[PDB]
Design a protein around this ligand. Sequence first.
Ligand SMILES: *[C@@H]1O[C@H](CO)[C@@H](O[C@@H]2O[C@H](CO)[C@@H](O)[C@H](O)[C@H]2NC(C)=O)[C@H](O)[C@H]1NC(C)=O
Lengths: 49, 49
Amino acid sequence: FASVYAWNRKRISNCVADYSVLYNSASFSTFKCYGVSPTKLNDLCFTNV
Amino acid sequence: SSTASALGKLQDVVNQNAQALNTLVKQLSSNFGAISSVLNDILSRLDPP
Ligand SMILES: *[C@@H]1O[C@H](CO)[C@@H](O[C@@H]2O[C@H](CO)[C@@H](O)[C@H](O)[C@H]2NC(C)=O)[C@H](O)[C@H]1NC(C)=O
């Protein structure tokens, strides 16, 4: 990965994502989210990420 | 029969009532400091606490 002053920005679109298989992963040090409840990330549908 | 605009009072009463009702029903669309003006989205997107 790049540095903080040159952070890597990427677009994700036109795919069937899967956050449930990613949320349950225990390798993450912290996972804190604002504005959405994580348990309700499997039914919301966005345009681009 | 010919000259109009002689019935101002009744028309004024009806206009006042209709305008008050319309502004009341329009008031429902405001955000009021929340993040969404439709209650279904806010219940279905964010944690109940
Ligand atoms: C990189 O990939 C590996 C393996 O594909 C991921 O390891 C998974 O870690 C979780 C939680 O630690 C386990 O429940 C899974 O069983 C692991 N996968 C396998 C195949 O055993 C790892 O999490 C991935 N890392 C990132 C940052 O995506």
